[PDB]
Coordinates of C-alpha atoms and ligand atoms in Angstrom, one line a residue:
Chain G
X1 CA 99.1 99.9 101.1
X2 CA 96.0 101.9 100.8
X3 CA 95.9 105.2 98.7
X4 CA 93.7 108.1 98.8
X5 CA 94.0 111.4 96.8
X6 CA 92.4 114.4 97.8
X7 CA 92.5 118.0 96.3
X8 CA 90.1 120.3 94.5
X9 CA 87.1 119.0 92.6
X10 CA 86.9 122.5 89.9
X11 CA 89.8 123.9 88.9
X12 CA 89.7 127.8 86.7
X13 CA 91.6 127.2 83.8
X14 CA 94.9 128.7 83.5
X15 CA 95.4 128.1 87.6
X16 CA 97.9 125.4 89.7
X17 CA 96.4 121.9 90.1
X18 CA 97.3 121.1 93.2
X19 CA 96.8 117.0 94.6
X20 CA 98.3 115.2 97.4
X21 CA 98.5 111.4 97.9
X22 CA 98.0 109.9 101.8
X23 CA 99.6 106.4 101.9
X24 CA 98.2 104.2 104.7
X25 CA 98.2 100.6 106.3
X26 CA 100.5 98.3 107.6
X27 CA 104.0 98.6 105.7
X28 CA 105.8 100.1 102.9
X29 CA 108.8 99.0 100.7
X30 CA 110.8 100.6 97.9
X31 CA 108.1 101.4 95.6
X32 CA 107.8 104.8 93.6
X33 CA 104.7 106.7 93.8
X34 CA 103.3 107.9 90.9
X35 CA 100.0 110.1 89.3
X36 CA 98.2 108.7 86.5
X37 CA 95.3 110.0 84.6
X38 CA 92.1 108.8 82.7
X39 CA 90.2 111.6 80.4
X40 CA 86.3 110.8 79.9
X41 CA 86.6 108.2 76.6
X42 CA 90.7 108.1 76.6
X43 CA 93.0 106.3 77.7
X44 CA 95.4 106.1 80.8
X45 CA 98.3 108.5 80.6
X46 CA 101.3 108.5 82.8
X47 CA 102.2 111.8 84.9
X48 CA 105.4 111.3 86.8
X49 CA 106.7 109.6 90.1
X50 CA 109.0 110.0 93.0
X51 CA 111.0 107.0 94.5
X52 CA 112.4 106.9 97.7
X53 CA 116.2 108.4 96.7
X54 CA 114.1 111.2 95.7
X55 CA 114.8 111.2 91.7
X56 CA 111.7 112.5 90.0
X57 CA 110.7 111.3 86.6
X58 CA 108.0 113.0 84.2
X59 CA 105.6 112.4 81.0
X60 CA 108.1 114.3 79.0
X61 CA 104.8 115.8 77.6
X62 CA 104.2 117.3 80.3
X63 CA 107.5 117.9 82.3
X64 CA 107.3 121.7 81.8
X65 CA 104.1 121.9 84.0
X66 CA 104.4 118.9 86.3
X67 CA 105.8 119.3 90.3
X68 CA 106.2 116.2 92.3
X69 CA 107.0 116.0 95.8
X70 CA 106.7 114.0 99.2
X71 CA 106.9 114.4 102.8
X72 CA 107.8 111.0 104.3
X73 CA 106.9 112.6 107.9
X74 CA 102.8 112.6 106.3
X75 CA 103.0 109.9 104.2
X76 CA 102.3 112.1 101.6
X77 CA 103.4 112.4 98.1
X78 CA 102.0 116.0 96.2
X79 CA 101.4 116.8 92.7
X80 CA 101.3 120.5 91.3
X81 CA 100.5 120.7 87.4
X82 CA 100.7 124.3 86.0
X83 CA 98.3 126.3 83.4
X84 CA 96.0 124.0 83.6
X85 CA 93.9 123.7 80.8
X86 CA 89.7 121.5 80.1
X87 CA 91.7 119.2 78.4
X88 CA 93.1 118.5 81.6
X89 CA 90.1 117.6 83.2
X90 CA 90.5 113.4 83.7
X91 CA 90.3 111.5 87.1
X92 CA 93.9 111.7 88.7
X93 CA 95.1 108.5 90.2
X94 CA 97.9 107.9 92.6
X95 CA 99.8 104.8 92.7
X96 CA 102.6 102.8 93.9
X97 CA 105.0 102.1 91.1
X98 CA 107.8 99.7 91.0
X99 CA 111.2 100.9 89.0
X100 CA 113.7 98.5 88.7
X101 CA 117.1 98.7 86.4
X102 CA 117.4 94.7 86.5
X103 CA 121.0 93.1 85.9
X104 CA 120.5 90.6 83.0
X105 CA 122.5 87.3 81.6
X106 CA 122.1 86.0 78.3
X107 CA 120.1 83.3 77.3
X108 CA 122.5 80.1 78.6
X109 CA 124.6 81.9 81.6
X110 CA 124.7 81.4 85.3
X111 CA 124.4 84.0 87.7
X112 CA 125.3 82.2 90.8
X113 CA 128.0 81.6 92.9
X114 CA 127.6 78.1 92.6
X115 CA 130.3 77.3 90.0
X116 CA 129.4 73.6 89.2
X117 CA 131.6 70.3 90.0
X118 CA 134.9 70.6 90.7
X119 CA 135.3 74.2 90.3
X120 CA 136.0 77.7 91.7
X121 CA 136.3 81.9 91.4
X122 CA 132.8 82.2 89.2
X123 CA 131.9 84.4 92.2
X124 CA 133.1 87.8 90.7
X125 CA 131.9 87.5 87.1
X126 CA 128.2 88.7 86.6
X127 CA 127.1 86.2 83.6
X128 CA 129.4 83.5 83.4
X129 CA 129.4 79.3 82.2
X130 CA 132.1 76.6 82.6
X131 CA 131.6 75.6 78.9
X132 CA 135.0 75.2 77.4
X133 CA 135.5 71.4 78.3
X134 CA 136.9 70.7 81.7
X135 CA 137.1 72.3 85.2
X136 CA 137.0 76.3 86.1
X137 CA 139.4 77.4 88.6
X138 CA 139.9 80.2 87.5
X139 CA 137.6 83.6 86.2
X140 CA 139.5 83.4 83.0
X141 CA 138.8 79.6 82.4
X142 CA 134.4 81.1 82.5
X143 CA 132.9 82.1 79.5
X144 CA 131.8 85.8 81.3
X145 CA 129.5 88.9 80.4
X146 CA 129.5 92.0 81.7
X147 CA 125.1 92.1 82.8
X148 CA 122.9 93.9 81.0
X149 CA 120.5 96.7 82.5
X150 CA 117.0 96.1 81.6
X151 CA 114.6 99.1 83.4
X152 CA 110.9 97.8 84.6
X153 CA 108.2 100.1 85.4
X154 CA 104.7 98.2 86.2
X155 CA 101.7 100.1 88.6
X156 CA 101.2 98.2 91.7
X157 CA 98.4 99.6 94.0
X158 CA 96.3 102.2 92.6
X159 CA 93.9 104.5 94.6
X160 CA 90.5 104.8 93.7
X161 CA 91.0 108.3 91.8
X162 CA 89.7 112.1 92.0
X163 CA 87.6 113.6 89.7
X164 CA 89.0 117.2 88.2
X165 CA 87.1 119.5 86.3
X166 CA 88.9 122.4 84.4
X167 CA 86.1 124.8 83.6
X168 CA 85.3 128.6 84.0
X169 CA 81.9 127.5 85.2
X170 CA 80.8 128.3 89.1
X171 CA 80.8 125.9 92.0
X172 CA 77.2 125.5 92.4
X173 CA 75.5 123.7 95.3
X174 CA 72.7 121.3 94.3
X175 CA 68.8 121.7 95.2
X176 CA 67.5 118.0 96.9
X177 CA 64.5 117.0 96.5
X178 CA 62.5 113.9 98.5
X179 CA 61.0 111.6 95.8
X180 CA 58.5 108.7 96.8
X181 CA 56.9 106.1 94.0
X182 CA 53.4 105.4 96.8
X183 CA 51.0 107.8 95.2
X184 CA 51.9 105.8 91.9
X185 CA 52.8 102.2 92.6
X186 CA 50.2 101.9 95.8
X187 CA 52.3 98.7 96.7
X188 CA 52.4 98.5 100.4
X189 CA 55.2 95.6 101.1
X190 CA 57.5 97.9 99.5
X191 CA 58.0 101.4 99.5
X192 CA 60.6 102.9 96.8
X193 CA 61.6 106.6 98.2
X194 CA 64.2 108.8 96.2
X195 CA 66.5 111.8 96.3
X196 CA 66.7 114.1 93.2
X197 CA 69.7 116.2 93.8
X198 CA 69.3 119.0 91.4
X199 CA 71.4 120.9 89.3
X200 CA 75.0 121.5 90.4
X201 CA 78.2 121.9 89.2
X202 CA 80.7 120.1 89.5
X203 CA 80.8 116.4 89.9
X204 CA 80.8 114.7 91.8
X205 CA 78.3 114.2 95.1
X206 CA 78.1 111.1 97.7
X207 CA 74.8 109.9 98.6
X208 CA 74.0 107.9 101.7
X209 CA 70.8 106.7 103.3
X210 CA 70.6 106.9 106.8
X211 CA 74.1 108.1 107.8
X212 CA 75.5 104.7 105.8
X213 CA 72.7 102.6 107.9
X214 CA 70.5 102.1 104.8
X215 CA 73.1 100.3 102.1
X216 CA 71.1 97.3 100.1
X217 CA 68.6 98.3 97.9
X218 CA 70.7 101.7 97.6
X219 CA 70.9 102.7 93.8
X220 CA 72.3 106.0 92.6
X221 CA 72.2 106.8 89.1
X222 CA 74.9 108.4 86.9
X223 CA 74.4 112.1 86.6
X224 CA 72.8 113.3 83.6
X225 CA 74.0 116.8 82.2
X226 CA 72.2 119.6 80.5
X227 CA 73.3 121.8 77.7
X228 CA 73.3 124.7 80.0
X229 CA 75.9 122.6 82.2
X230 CA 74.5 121.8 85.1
X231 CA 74.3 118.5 86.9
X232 CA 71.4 116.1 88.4
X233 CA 71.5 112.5 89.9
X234 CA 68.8 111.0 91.6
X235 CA 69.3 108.1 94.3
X236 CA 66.7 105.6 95.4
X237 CA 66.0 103.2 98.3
X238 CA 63.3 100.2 97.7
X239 CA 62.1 99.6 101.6
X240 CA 60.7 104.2 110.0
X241 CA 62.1 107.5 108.9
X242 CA 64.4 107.9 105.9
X243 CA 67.0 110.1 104.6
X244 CA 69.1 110.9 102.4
X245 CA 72.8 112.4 103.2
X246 CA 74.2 114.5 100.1
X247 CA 77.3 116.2 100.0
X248 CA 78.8 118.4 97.3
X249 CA 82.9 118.8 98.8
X250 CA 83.1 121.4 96.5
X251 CA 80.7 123.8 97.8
X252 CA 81.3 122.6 101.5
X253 CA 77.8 121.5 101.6
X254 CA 75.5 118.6 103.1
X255 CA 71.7 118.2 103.1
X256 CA 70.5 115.9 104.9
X257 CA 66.8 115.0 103.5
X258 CA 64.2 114.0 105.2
X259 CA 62.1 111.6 102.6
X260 CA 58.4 110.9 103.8
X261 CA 56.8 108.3 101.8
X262 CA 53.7 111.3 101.2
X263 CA 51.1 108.7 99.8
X264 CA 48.1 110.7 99.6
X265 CA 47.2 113.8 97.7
X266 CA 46.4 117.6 99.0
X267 CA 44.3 118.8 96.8
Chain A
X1 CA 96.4 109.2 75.4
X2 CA 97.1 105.7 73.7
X3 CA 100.7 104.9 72.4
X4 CA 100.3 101.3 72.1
X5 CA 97.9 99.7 70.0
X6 CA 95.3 97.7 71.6
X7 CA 91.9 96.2 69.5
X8 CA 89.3 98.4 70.7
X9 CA 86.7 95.7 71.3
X10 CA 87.0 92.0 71.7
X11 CA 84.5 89.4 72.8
X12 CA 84.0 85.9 73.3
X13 CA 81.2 83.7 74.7
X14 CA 80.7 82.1 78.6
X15 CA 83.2 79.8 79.4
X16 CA 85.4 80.5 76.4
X17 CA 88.6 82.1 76.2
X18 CA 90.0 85.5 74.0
X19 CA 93.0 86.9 74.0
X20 CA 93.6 91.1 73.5
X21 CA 97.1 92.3 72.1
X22 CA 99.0 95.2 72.4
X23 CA 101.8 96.4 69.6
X24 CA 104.6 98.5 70.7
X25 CA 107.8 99.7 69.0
X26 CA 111.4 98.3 70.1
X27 CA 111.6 101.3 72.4
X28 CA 108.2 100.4 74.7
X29 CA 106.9 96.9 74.3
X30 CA 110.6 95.3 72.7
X31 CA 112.2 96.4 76.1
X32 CA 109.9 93.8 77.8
X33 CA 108.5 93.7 81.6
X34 CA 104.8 94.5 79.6
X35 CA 102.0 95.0 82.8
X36 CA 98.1 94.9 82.1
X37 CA 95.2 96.4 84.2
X38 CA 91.7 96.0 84.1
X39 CA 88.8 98.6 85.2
X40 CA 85.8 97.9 86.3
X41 CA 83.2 100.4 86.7
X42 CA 83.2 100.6 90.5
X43 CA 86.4 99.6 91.4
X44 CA 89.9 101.3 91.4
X45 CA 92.3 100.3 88.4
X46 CA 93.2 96.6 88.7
X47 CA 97.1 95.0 88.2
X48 CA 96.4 91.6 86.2
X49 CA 100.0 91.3 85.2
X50 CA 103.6 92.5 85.5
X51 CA 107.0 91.5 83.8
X52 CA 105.2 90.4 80.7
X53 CA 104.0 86.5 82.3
X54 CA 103.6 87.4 86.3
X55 CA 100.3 86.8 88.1
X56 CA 99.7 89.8 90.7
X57 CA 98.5 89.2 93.9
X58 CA 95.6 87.7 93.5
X59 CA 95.2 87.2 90.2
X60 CA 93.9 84.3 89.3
X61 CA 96.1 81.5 86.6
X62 CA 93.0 81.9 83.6
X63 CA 94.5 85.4 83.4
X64 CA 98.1 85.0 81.3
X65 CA 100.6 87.1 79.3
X66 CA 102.5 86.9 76.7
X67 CA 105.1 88.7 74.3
X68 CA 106.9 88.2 71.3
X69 CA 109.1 91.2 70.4
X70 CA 107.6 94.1 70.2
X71 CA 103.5 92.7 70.6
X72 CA 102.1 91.3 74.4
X73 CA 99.1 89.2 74.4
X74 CA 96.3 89.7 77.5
X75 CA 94.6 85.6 77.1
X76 CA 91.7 85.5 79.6
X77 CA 90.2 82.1 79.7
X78 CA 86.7 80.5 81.2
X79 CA 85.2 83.6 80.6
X80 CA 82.8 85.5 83.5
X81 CA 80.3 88.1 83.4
X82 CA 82.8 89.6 86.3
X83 CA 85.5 90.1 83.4
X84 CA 84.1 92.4 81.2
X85 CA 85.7 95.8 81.7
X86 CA 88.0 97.8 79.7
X87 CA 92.1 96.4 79.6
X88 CA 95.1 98.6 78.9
X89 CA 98.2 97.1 78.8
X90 CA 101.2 99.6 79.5
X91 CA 105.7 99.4 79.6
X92 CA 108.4 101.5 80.3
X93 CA 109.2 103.8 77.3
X94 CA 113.0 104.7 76.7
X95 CA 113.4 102.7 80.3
X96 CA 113.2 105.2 83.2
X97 CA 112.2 108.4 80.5
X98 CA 108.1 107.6 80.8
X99 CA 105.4 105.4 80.7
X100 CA 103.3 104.8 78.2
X101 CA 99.5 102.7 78.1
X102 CA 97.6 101.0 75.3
X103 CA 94.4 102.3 73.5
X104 CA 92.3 99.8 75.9
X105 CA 90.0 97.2 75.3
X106 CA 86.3 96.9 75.8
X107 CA 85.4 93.1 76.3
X108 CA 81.7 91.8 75.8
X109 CA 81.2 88.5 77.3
X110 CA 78.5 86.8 75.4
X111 CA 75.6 84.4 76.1
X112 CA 74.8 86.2 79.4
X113 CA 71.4 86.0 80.3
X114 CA 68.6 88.5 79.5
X115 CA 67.3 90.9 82.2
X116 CA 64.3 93.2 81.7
X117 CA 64.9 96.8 83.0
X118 CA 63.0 97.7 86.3
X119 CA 61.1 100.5 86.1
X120 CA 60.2 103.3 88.8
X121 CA 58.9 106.6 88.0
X122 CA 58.8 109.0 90.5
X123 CA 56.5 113.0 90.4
X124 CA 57.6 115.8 91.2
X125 CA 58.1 117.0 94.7
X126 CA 55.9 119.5 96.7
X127 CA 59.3 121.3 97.9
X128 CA 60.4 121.5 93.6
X129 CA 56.5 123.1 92.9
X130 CA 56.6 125.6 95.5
X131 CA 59.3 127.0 92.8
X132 CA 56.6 126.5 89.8
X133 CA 58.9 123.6 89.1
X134 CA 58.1 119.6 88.3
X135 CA 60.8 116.8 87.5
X136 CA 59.5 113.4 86.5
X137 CA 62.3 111.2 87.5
X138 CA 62.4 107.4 85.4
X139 CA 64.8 105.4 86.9
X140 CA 65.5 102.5 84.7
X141 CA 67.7 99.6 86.7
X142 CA 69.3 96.2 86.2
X143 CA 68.7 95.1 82.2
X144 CA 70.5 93.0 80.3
X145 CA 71.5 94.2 77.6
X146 CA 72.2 97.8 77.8
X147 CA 70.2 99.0 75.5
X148 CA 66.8 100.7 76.0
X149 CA 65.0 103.0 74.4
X150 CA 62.8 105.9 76.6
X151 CA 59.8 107.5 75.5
X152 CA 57.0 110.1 77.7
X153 CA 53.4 110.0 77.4
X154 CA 50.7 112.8 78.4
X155 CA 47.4 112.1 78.3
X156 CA 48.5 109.7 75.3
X157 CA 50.6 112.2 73.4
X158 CA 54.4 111.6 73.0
X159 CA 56.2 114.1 74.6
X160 CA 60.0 115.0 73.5
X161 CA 60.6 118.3 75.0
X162 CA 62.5 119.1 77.7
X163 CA 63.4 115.1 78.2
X164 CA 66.9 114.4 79.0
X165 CA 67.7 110.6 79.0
X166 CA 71.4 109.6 80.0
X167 CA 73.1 106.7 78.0
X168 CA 72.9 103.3 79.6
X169 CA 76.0 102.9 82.2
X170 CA 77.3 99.1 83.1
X171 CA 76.2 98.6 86.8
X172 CA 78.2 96.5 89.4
X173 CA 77.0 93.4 87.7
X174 CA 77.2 93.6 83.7
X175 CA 73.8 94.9 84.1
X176 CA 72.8 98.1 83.0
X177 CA 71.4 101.2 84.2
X178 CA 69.7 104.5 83.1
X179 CA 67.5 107.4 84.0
X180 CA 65.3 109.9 82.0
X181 CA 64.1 113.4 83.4
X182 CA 61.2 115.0 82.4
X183 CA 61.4 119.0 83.1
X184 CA 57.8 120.7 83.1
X185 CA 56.7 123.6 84.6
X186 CA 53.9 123.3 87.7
X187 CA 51.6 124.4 85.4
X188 CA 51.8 121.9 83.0
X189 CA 52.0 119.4 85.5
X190 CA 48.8 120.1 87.1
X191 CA 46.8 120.3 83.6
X192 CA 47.0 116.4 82.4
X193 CA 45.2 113.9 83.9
X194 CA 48.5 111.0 83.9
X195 CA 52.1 111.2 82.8
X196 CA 54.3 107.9 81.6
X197 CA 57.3 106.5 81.3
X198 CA 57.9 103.5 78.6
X199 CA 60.5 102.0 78.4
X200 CA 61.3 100.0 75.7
X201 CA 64.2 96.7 76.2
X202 CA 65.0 93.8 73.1
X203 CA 61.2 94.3 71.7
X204 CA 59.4 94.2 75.6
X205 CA 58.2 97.8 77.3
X206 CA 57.3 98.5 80.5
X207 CA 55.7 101.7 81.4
X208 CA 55.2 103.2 84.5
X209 CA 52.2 106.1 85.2
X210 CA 51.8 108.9 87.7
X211 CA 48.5 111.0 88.0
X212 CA 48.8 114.5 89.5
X213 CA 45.0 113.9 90.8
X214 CA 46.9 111.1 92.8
X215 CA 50.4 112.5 94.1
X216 CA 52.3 115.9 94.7
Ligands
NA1 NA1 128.6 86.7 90.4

């Protein structure tokens, strides 16, 4: 299975958070899906999930404000969270979650139907041994338990996660700038040519070189932030034209960059 | 946030083996059917293991799992560089009610090799100056280990305002990266004759210079 969240990147506080969940690829079985969530610095924390009778279970934390729902016909599993507040900013994961109430024996019992040697009618008991000395032929010649229930959860597939951001802060489209090392480095086997996308809010932004043609030798940088709050991240290339591909989603913006290695000096 | 406890770091050397636990109450961890994930900085949440002892697909067998009542034990042997990442183990809590996740684990494999940081300091754009502008951008790539130190240079003076420098971030390697910006005016970038960037790695520096008589 292959998971892939999508929603909003910037959220104003005290609005709806509203993700969905596409499942893809080549089969699916019985598993829940679920949300998760990671904080900057903290730890996971569990949201809720939907399994395929349609029962619904919640972070009782967080029950009051949580919505889960799916759409088999998409493949789609949604999550609405209510009032949301910064401390709700976190990367949301969906996942495939298996929930199992399990029927256990005791340490020492059989579960089969095969009774042992000689002997019969263990079929119907859930737990049961042929320990009193001779043959069973009977279900009340088994020593015999009623199984216990014993409920697993475990994640099985996560996606790869969407950043939120719960601020009162504007969507704001970066600035790119080209950046070349030549009038420094004056190497000429290698050319190192940059991107500086400027000041923008919020995370994230992709970077490509060459529409994904340009992939070794690719390194972009974590974002630094400033105390006024806005964003940069700068992207280089160690190498014929080059370019770099940004795109903020949450401005429904690209900039394509032309990046000339500009070795000399105007003065 | 954390319910179960977890150590916060643990570390052990190349080839060795160390083992993270995770204490629960009778209600989470006592119930059994304990799972543990790994992430890694560029890579979705891994499963490592399910039902307290089970190997997820593929998972290999120097990952195992333990429990004894109400603590699970993470043991990763023949230790990697490719292992360090953060670990959260995680169970049921009141069965079907919720879910609840350990504190996490940072492990530090140690021994790994030393890598300098490579340095590349790019000037300002023309396109940034037309707005009486200039970023000098100090990119600071694959060193071993993450901890440098960044300082700016004017015509031989130290600079510190108006530089931003981001904390080292564990690359797709164990290596480390980082980057420092140096915001100026146009002004002030046109009236020195050279601008560094030194960076400073386990006692070595390397320092990259750009002269606005020779770019932008
Ligand atoms: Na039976």
């Amino acid at each position: 299975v292959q998971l892939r969240e999508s929603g909003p990147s910037l959220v104003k506080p005290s609005q709806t958070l509203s993700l969905t969940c596409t499942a893809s690829g080549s089969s699916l079985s019985d598993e829940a899906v679920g949300w998760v969530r990671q904080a900057p610095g903290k730890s996971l924390e569990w949201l809720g999930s939907i399994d395929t009778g349609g029962n619904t279970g919640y972070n009782p934390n967080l029950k009051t404000r949580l919505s889960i729902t799916k759409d088999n016909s998409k493949s789609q599993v949604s999550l609405s969270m209510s009032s949301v507040t910064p401390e709700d900013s976190a990367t949301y994961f969906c996942a495939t979650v298996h929930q199992e109430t399990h029927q256990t024996c005791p340490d020492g019992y059989n579960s089969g139907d095969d009774c042992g040697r000689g002997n019969w009618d263990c079929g119907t008991l859930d737990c049961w041994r042929c320990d009193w000395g001779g043959f069973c032929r009977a279900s009340t010649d088994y020593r015999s338990v009623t199984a216990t229930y014993t409920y697993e959860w475990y994640i099985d597939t996560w996606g790869q996660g969407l950043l939120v951001t719960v601020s009162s802060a504007s969507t704001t489209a970066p600035k790119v700038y080209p950046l070349s090392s030549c009038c420094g480095d004056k190497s000429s086997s290698t050319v190192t040519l940059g991107c500086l996308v400027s000041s923008y809010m919020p995370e994230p932004v992709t970077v490509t070189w060459n529409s994904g043609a340009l992939k070794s030798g690719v390194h972009t940088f974590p974002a630094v932030l400033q105390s006024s709050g806005l964003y940069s991240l700068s992207s280089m290339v160690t190498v014929q034209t080059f370019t770099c591909n940004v795109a903020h989603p949450a401005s429904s913006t690209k900039v394509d960059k032309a990046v000339d290695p500009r070795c000399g000096k105007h003065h | 946030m954390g319910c179960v406890a977890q150590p916060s770091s643990v570390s052990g050397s190349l080839g060795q083996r160390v083992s993270i636990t995770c204490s629960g109450s009778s209600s989470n961890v006592g119930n059994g059917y304990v799972s543990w994930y790994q992430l890694i900085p560029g890579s979705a949440p891994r499963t490592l293991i399910y039902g307290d002892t089970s190997r997820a697909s593929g998972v290999p067998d120097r990952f195992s799992g333990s429990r004894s009542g109400n603590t699970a034990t993470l043991t990763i042997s023949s230790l990697q560089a490719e292992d360090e990442a953060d670990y959260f183990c995680a169970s049921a809590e009141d069965s079907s009610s919720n879910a609840v996740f350990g504190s996490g684990t940072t492990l530090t494999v140690l021994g790994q090799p030393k890598s300098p940081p490579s340095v590349t300091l790019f000037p300002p754009s023309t396109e940034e100056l037309n707005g009486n502008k200039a970023t000098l951008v100090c990119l600071i790539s694959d060193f071993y280990p993450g901890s440098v130190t960044v300082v700016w240079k004017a015509d031989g003076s130290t600079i510190t305002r108006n530089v931003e420098t981001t904390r080292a971030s564990k690359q797709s390697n164990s290596k480390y990266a980082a980057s420092s910006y140096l915001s100026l005016t146009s002004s002030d970038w046109k009236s020195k004759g050279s601008y560094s960037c030194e960076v400073t790695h386990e006692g070595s520096t390397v320092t990259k210079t750009v002269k606005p008589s020779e770019c932008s």
